[PDB]
Design an enzyme around this catalytic site. Structure first.
Site, mmCIF file in Angstrom:
data_model
loop_
_atom_site.group_PDB
_atom_site.id
_atom_site.type_symbol
_atom_site.label_atom_id
_atom_site.label_comp_id
_atom_site.label_asym_id
_atom_site.label_seq_id
_atom_site.Cartn_x
_atom_site.Cartn_y
_atom_site.Cartn_z
ATOM 1 N N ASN A 54 6.105 1.531 19.229
ATOM 2 C CA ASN A 54 7.270 1.374 18.382
ATOM 3 C C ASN A 54 8.527 1.967 19.003
ATOM 4 O O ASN A 54 9.620 1.497 18.687
ATOM 5 C CB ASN A 54 7.003 1.982 17.006
ATOM 6 C CG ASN A 54 5.725 1.465 16.377
ATOM 7 O OD1 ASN A 54 5.319 0.327 16.609
ATOM 8 N ND2 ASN A 54 5.083 2.303 15.574
ATOM 9 N N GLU A 77 0.839 -1.191 0.000
ATOM 10 C CA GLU A 77 0.000 0.000 0.000
ATOM 11 C C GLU A 77 0.878 1.245 0.000
ATOM 12 O O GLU A 77 1.700 1.409 0.908
ATOM 13 C CB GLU A 77 -0.920 0.001 1.213
ATOM 14 C CG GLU A 77 -2.139 0.888 1.062
ATOM 15 C CD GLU A 77 -2.722 1.311 2.393
ATOM 16 O OE1 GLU A 77 -1.969 1.342 3.389
ATOM 17 O OE2 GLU A 77 -3.932 1.615 2.443
ATOM 18 N N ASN A 90 0.853 -6.481 21.382
ATOM 19 C CA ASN A 90 0.480 -5.089 21.607
ATOM 20 C C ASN A 90 -0.191 -4.893 22.961
ATOM 21 O O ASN A 90 -0.014 -3.845 23.592
ATOM 22 C CB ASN A 90 -0.434 -4.600 20.485
ATOM 23 C CG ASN A 90 0.149 -4.846 19.111
ATOM 24 O OD1 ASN A 90 0.843 -3.996 18.555
ATOM 25 N ND2 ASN A 90 -0.149 -6.009 18.546
ATOM 26 N N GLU A 142 26.699 -15.131 18.807
ATOM 27 C CA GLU A 142 26.839 -15.624 20.175
ATOM 28 C C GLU A 142 25.495 -15.734 20.886
ATOM 29 O O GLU A 142 25.199 -16.774 21.490
ATOM 30 C CB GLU A 142 27.811 -14.754 20.971
ATOM 31 C CG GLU A 142 29.271 -14.963 20.591
ATOM 32 C CD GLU A 142 30.219 -14.090 21.394
ATOM 33 O OE1 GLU A 142 29.735 -13.243 22.171
ATOM 34 O OE2 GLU A 142 31.449 -14.251 21.247
HETATM 35 N N1 LIG Z 1 3.263 -2.729 17.722
HETATM 36 C C1 LIG Z 1 2.742 -2.283 16.585
HETATM 37 N N2 LIG Z 1 1.886 -3.084 15.857
HETATM 38 C C2 LIG Z 1 1.351 -2.633 14.698
HETATM 39 C C3 LIG Z 1 1.659 -1.367 14.228
HETATM 40 N N3 LIG Z 1 0.995 -1.185 13.066
HETATM 41 C C4 LIG Z 1 0.277 -2.297 12.793
HETATM 42 N N4 LIG Z 1 0.486 -3.200 13.800
HETATM 43 C C5 LIG Z 1 -0.084 -4.554 13.892
HETATM 44 O O1 LIG Z 1 -0.509 -4.960 12.610
HETATM 45 C C6 LIG Z 1 -1.759 -5.612 12.663
HETATM 46 C C7 LIG Z 1 -2.580 -5.242 11.433
HETATM 47 O O2 LIG Z 1 -2.044 -5.819 10.261
HETATM 48 P P1 LIG Z 1 -0.835 -5.121 9.460
HETATM 49 O O3 LIG Z 1 0.497 -5.713 9.840
HETATM 50 O O4 LIG Z 1 -0.853 -3.636 9.726
HETATM 51 O O5 LIG Z 1 -1.136 -5.376 7.905
HETATM 52 P P2 LIG Z 1 -0.353 -4.472 6.836
HETATM 53 O O6 LIG Z 1 1.096 -4.359 7.236
HETATM 54 O O7 LIG Z 1 -1.003 -3.114 6.751
HETATM 55 O O8 LIG Z 1 -0.497 -5.259 5.441
HETATM 56 P P3 LIG Z 1 -1.943 -5.379 4.752
HETATM 57 O O9 LIG Z 1 -2.911 -6.021 5.713
HETATM 58 O O10 LIG Z 1 -1.861 -6.215 3.503
HETATM 59 O O11 LIG Z 1 -2.420 -3.992 4.402
HETATM 60 C C8 LIG Z 1 -2.421 -5.149 13.948
HETATM 61 O O12 LIG Z 1 -3.000 -6.240 14.623
HETATM 62 C C9 LIG Z 1 -1.310 -4.559 14.789
HETATM 63 O O13 LIG Z 1 -1.076 -5.367 15.917
HETATM 64 C C10 LIG Z 1 2.518 -0.556 14.956
HETATM 65 O O14 LIG Z 1 2.799 0.570 14.556
HETATM 66 N N5 LIG Z 1 3.058 -1.019 16.136
HETATM 67 MG MG LIG Z 2 -1.255 -2.216 4.853
#
Ligand SMILES: Nc1nc2c(ncn2[C@@H]2O[C@H](COP(=O)(O)OP(=O)(O)OP(=O)(O)O)[C@@H](O)[C@H]2O)c(=O)[nH]1
Ligand SMILES: [Mg+2]
Ligand SMILES: Nc1nc2c(ncn2[C@@H]2O[C@H](COP(=O)(O)OP(=O)(O)OP(=O)(O)O)[C@@H](O)[C@H]2O)c(=O)[nH]1
Ligand SMILES: Nc1nc2c(ncn2[C@@H]2O[C@H](COP(=O)(O)OP(=O)(O)O)[C@@H](O)[C@H]2O)c(=O)[nH]1
Ligand SMILES: Nc1nc2c(ncn2[C@@H]2O[C@H](COP(=O)(O)OP(=O)(O)O)[C@@H](O)[C@H]2O)c(=O)[nH]1
Ligand SMILES: [Mg+2]
Lengths: 78, 437, 431, 431, 437
Positions: B228, B71, B206, B254
């Site tokens: 983050n 995206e 999270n 290690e």
């Molecule tokens: N810790 C943390 N987790 C995140 C963050 N952004 C998204 N997530 C995790 O990502 C999950 C949602 O799916 P994504 O990994 O964002 O999916 P994507 O990377 O956008 O890829 P697509 O689904 O194909 O659009 C959520 O359940 C969050 O736990 C972030 O900034 N920090």
């Molecule tokens: Mg995405």
């Protein structure tokens, strides 16, 4: 400002000794809305306070210079 | 010469990359233009930056990172953001469509046409790299880009590179709090691929971070910025032994080989201590004994997984700051003599300590306290099967009547793949309780 | 780059799409002329989702307006924000609609649809990467249930793998305004089921109840109703245009909401809705925003959510928030009433959060429900259809124009089969 | 965070709660427009007990006023501190109460109670603690009795472990003013016994007497009475507010008050009360304050407690005072009037002290006397009900709306067994 | 080195801890912000703070006492008044609901949601030590947080810490003056759990201190502050021998083994002398013999029971100030030569005398005068049998027809618990009288 008359400095480089040499840490936006949280990582600059006081970084000039040339080899006639 | 290429896949990967490269630049004193400041003519003795940035022919710093997200919004924001001059233009690789929480869509469709370009950029980085200690991949098990494309990318780096390490930082879904709906499907399907192509598989949940921020930091409204930044502190404390010197240096190989007993338990559990705020941290010593005792607690875990229901197989502890080995050894002795921490019977000596003189570099505007001692503790406890038991429960009660499966079978996913992943993870947790008992 | 082709049809569709365009042009900072007097760069970063570039910097919406009478086209063109549209995609016919499904699907509308598809192919291959199409028909007219479903069928057959988003206004027990409305609705939902990726069905009676309870307005007219629907539209497709935190596009909503392919009839709701005097006494944060989403008084479908089980719930939030707070609130409402929720989909609320609020209010949210409570509305429509059809009332028009009663038989059969499909996943248990 | 939702049923309840908000907003420093014009920091410390918080620093009451006639909404909104209430918390009907318990409970109060429970639930669990539900009403009328008791029943069904306070204006025989007061009181005390946790009964005859011979006002028209009631409300609820040396909240009072569950009818009294001609002549020491507190002529109930026996006695003092003066006075009153205290409960008096006095005087006290003399009102209401139920008087005006005589007979039986229960501990022994 | 971690439960506990820590800060010279003002560098040692106050790396005196209540009123008053930055944020644990003079409510339904957090905080305070000496618990027997939650807290403390001393300071209900109706019920239910399962328990009424404030201090309408100050003086005189220096110091574990004969008799009574105002203090000849014979006056005890109608089993007499260890023995001889003061037969020597050099401090705004020599006479005797007999009479009178028991049954506790506790205290009364005879 100096981080020496205000803190303790232990062999810190000039780069952190003067934190005013850091530029680009502002990037002020447009009109104060449209303020997405993802661009909040380019926030307030490092200053005299939020700066490292110690810089324990290894230097690999000697090791790199010997590693480029190569280790010793038994080459002779005796 | 010690150099690590970081690959940030997904929206979670890109946001982790932003909050970790901010910490890296602010720790090495590099302004977000990528320009190294005034070094007083002669550059002097300093090469800590080499593990993440490269000296080009100008004095600049291009990072060893590949930001991939299908995206084109979260990465276009980075291209228009304050760090727009840091990254190389052909490093923030993006597509034109989305994968949309779909492992099949991220693996057998639009995610496939971009893996060649991602591998070409990885190849160029490795060619300009002298000594590659290991790839460092950040993603999430939410679904779509973070699971399918991450799995494909790990398989391709396994079949081309091999040998060299591949650390993984995977965002793991919580027992209760969840954003997507097909997260159990996307997380079951990716274990099949992150099993045999990963050397370490660090897991972050999270909800544990939310509880940590609400309890220890006195912030009632946490978010992805704080999440983050905590994960960035974890990875920085993990990798700081390369860039900054220390007594008892513990590098990537290690604590790879002193943490995994067998080549199926390679899923460690991170913990950061102290995670305290500043107003609280005014009133403690923050001694080594204190920051070690407040690190095995179930209230400070990073996965929402209490280690009391299991045994510690291995434990690496990376101390970062003004710590003394006498206090480290006294803390280890007290931890061993305490009875609630149950170590496994076939490992009486499992503790790998690593000291670094450099204190953790505080980011201005962050919520964390700014203190001269910290510990990043990587346990290998057997309790980690609890999350996977709940995962199997959710997967079974969705797959009992074939919910949400038509998207997968239209975009890939022959119907035996779900059963195969379920069987593999069930056999794996069988292996985990086998090594637990 | 993602983008959405808009295809409006009918008097209701043209009016409500004109309102939609004149509210999202204000959201993006676009003049009635079509020139950008904005104040930031995030408006122009993703302006190509809805607008096409012209000479000089003018922006032309990618909307194809379809009618069978001149009528509402002339009214919209004479109205404000009527000079922004392309004059070459104002395609209409000279005949009458007749509020007749048969006339809209088989008569002179069957050759107007050729010109409409020519215009749509022009607007689709004058592009780079279609996210999909949205359509806003009326479900009870001759053009909304006619031209609209014919457009859906042709687009589905020609582009088979792009997201189709049809909003549609379902009929209502009270407030009818049309006598052959059950006939048109039953004949149109059959084409809606096999050809549309998802529908966001809206009811005029529920909109009138929302106006008479929450947003007082004394006289609610149609401008405020179309404003509510347009706010729902801009809320649901906001992550395509505005960046921020964890986002969700239309395909992500489609893959998260519909479990089984014939279950894509959604139950929408916009919920920063507060009265003119109640705005001062209102507090605006995530918990009360959440309960206003999960309030049955603020739903744009007339069906009671307590009369069924939610399959899935989409929550598209807008503004600088705490998504810890929104996730805790979603888990809290699920644990509060787990009775009105399916057990075999654990934590069935897809949540997305964007960091760009709409104009006016500080903090926004859009609710989408794939509830099993829409089966009572569908059963009601089937009841009206069979009560009218047992005596073959108002059928001589359809049969004389030419449609056999077998078509009505298959329409009612698919009607009842969809009702049974919604019914089984309401008392179906886990184990 | 301990906090009460306040609900006022009937015209009497609406006025007597409007005065309560008018006095505690003045106590907390809140202006009529809803902002904090307070000097002390301590005023905005426990304001979450009775107030919410909106945008712009505006504090609204947690009041969910309910009636069924529209004139009382005008009378409560046109008055001072009337615009402070949230307009969504104003649910009522356009019908007529009829001074009919059957109308207010079964026929026309049952339609409104769903929306009333909706708004009460919203204002109650848009919260974090929710200690108290304070309903305020009059026995003898219409919606004060029937609607109030139905609301009590539904809320006690919904929340079985929360404190229920009811400020009930029980009817007196000398005042009368209504011919169906014994019917309504006898038929509503049935629901007040089995449900409420603390019920404070207030006699209008006692209020008129305390205005005549204590305040010495020539024409105590309609506001001095509910001002005294509001002062008593603030006295009994101040411990959840401004901190003192020995506080006692609603649970702390309720545990130490009732010896047995159906003995929760209390006789309240607030007596730093002096006429304007004697306020310059009297001192305000603790002995004077407590002797005129235990004086029976400063009681808000027409029952003379000399013709009875104290079960338990409360004393909530306000002001910076000495706690081995208040304690030795609480011991001295027992040692003096030991005959009027029950011998099987040593130390019948529970004492609480808060250090912040009400607006006006620098010291005050509130008296809550659970005594076995409260049966006088109950016996007189039972006698007037059984003098009317013999020759079926005024009974078709309940059976037409729909009730059998079995409900009336069971209400009279539950009246008489409670009177016998209080008589049992009036005439008993320690061993 | 010698740690005296305190837990203050109940509203009486929090107020008495406020007075106690005001006294500790004023006699250790610590300003309420934590620092030590007035050019601290004078003096070489001054390690007396390391009994009650910790010391961080920056050098802040952080106290060792957890203020726990269920209602947030008094705790928030402490957090907002004067001593604000002195205490840690996770040191003033508070709850949502109140216990409401109800032992069952504070022990079985509300007490278990805060017990884990208070035990974790006690864990952290005890880990921040170098060898603990003794817990000091402060509560009231009026009921609620001070009785039921105190009992559950003491149970879990005895489970966790094995044999550490757990000294009680209990506000016992007075004979006539009392401020509740269920206080006999709460005391009966509390004596069962504090008798066999806790260490030595100092126990004071309220009207004895009321009479003492009326007579000795010549002050006629004061409040609870001028009681909490006196009990703070008593506890300071008790655990001052750990901090200060002097001849024949009395350690905290040496108080118990030399005061209480049998492990069920651990309820002594305290008496502080000389309590006096300034005008009366200027007019006499305060001396060791005078304060010794004024300790044993029956009109100066802090427990309303006549010791003339009982037997003196043991007496630990602690002194502060300009006291020589010869006038002490001269006073012990002239006390033991008196026939009215009666000691038990199996006790030829009945006195443990201890002396501390530094005189008791004077609080600004107090009513006590600048005293040069003081005694905290702590006597174990049989005179409290009358008080517990009176409380048994009150409890049996109220329990004759089951008053107020429907609450305790409602949140859950069997009706036989009252009978079990009553027969336990009856056996205790039997034990006291058979020890006396
Ligand atoms: N810790 C943390 N987790 C995140 C963050 N952004 C998204 N997530 C995790 O990502 C999950 C949602 O799916 P994504 O990994 O964002 O999916 P994507 O990377 O956008 O890829 P697509 O689904 O194909 O659009 C959520 O359940 C969050 O736990 C972030 O900034 N920090
Ligand atoms: Mg995405
Ligand atoms: N000596 C002394 N006693 C006090 C003080 N404050 C309260 N008390 C005693 O405490 C008893 C009442 O119990 P509290 O301590 O107030 O109540 P709690 O322990 O906080 O538990 P709750 O009843 O739920 O509030 C009274 O009988 C008082 O004798 C004080 O400051 N000094
Ligand atoms: N929300 C909304 N609904 C409308 C509006 N105008 C008409 N309708 C509804 O549309 C229905 C009639 O459909 P119509 O537009 O006449 O279909 P057509 O004849 O094919 O164009 C009526 O039941 C109205 O309730 C409008 O401006 N806004
Ligand atoms: N003390 C007091 N009594 C009142 C007040 N208003 C009404 N009453 C009494 O309440 C009775 C009428 O109750 P009413 O208000 O009609 O109840 P409703 O029909 O439910 O509104 C009358 O006999 C009055 O004596 C008031 O403001 N204060
Ligand atoms: Mg209390």
């Amino acid at each position: 400002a100096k981080t020496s008359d205000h803190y303790r400095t232990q062999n810190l480089p000039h780069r952190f000794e003067n934190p005013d040499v850091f530029e680009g840490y502002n990037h002020k936006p447009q009109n104060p809305l449209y303020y997405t949280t993802n661009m909040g990582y380019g926030s307030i600059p490092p200053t005299v306070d939020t700066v490292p006081t110690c810089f324990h970084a290894k230097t690999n000039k000697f090791s790199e210079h010997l590693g480029k040339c190569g280790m010793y080899r038994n080459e002779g006639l005796n | 010469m010690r150099e690590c290429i970081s690959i940030h896949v997904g929206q979670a990967g890109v946001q982790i990359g932003n909050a970790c490269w901010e910490l890296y630049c602010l720790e090495h004193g590099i302004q977000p233009d990528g320009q190294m400041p005034s070094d007083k003519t002669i550059g002097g003795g300093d090469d800590s930056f080499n593990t993440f940035f490269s000296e080009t022919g100008a004095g600049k710093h291009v990072p060893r990172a590949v930001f991939v997200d299908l995206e084109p919004t979260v990465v276009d924001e980075v291209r228009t953001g304050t760090y727009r001059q840091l990254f190389h233009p052909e490093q923030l690789i993006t597509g034109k469509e989305d994968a949309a929480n779909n492992y099949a869509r991220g693996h057998y469709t639009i995610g496939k046409e971009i893996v060649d370009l991602v591998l070409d950029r990885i190849r160029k980085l490795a060619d300009q790299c002298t000594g590659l200690q290991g790839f460092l991949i950040f993603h999430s098990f939410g679904g779509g880009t973070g699971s399918g494309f991450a799995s494909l990318l790990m398989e391709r780096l396994s079949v081309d590179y091999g040998k060299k390490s591949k650390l993984e930082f995977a965002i793991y879904p919580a027992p209760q709090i969840s954003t997507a709906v097909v997260e159990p499907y996307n997380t079951i399907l990716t274990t099949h691929t992150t099993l045999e192509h990963s050397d370490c598989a660090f897991m972050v949940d999270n909800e544990a971070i939310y509880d940590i921020c609400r309890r220890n930091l006195d912030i009632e409204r946490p978010t992805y910025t704080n999440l983050n930044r905590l994960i960035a502190q974890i990875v920085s404390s993990i990798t700081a032994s390369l860039r900054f010197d220390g007594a008892l240096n513990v590098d990537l190989t290690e604590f790879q080989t002193n943490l995994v007993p067998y080549p199926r338990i390679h899923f460690p559990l991170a913990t950061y201590a102290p995670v305290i705020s500043a107003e609280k941290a005014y009133h403690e010593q923050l001694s080594v004994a204190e920051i070690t005792n407040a690190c095995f607690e179930p209230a400070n875990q990073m996965v929402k997984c209490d280690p009391r229901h299991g045994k510690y197989m291995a434990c690496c502890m990376l101390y970062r700051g003004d710590v003394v080995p006498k206090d480290v050894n006294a803390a280890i002795a007290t931890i061993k003599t305490k009875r609630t921490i149950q170590f496994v019977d076939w490992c009486p000596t499992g503790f790998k300590v690593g000291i670094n003189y450099q204190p953790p570099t505080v980011v201005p505007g962050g919520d964390l306290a700014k203190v001269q001692r910290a510990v990043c503790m990587l346990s290998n406890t057997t309790a980690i099967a609890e999350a996977w038991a709940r995962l199997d429960h959710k997967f079974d009660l969705m797959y009992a009547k074939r919910a949400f499966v038509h998207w997968y079978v239209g975009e890939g996913m022959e119907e035996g793949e779900f059963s195969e992943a379920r069987e593999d993870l069930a056999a794996l947790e069988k292996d985990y309780e086998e090594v637990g008992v | 780059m993602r983008e959405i082709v808009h295809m409006q049809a009918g008097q209701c569709g043209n009016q409500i799409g004109a309102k939609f365009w004149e509210v999202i042009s204000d959201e993006h900072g676009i003049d009635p002329t079509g020139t950008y007097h904005g104040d930031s760069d995030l408006q122009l970063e993703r302006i190509n989702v809805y607008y096409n570039e012209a000479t000089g910097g003018k922006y032309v919406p990618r909307a194809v307006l379809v009618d069978l009478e001149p009528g509402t086209m002339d009214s919209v063109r004479s109205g404000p924000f009527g000079q922004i549209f392309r004059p070459d995609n104002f395609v209409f016919g000279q005949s009458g609609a007749g509020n007749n499904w048969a006339k809209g699907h088989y008569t002179e509308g069957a050759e107007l649809v050729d010109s409409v598809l020519d215009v749509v192919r022009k607007e689709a291959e004058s592009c780079d990467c279609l996210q999909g199409f949205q359509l806003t028909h009326s479900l009870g007219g001759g053009t909304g249930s006619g031209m609209g479903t014919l457009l859906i069928s042709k687009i589905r057959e020609e582009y088979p793998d792009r997201i189709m988003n049809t909003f549609s206004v379902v009929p209502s027990p009270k407030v009818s305004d049309t006598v052959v409305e059950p006939y048109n609705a039953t004949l149109s939902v059959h084409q809606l089921v096999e050809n549309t990726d998802e529908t966001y069905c809206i009811d005029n009676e529920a909109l009138y109840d929302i106006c008479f309870r929450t947003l007082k307005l004394t006289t609610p007219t149609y401008g405020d109703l179309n404003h509510l629907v347009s706010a729902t539209m801009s809320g649901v497709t906001t992550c395509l245009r505005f960046p921020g935190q964890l986002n969700a596009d239309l395909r992500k909503l489609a893959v998260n909401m519909v479990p089984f392919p014939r279950l894509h009839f959604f139950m929408p709701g916009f919920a920063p809705l507060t009265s003119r005097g109640s705005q001062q006494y209102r507090a605006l944060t995530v918990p009360e925003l959440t309960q206003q989403m999960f309030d049955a008084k603020n739903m744009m479908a007339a069906c009671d959510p307590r009369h069924g089980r939610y399959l899935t719930v989409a929550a598209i939030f807008r503004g600088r928030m705490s998504m810890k707070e929104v996730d805790e609130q979603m888990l809290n409402v699920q644990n509060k009433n787990s009775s009105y929720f399916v057990e075999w989909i654990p934590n069935n609320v897809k949540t997305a959060v964007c960091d760009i609020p709409p104009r006016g209010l500080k903090m926004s949210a859009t609710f989408i429900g794939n509830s099993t409570a829409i089966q009572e509305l569908f059963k009601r429509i089937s009841e009206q259809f069979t009560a009218m059809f047992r005596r073959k009332a108002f059928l001589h028009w359809y049969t004389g124009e030419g449609m056999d009663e077998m078509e009505f038989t298959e329409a009612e059969s698919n009607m009842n089969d969809l009702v049974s499909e919604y019914q089984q996943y309401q008392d179906a248990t886990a184990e």
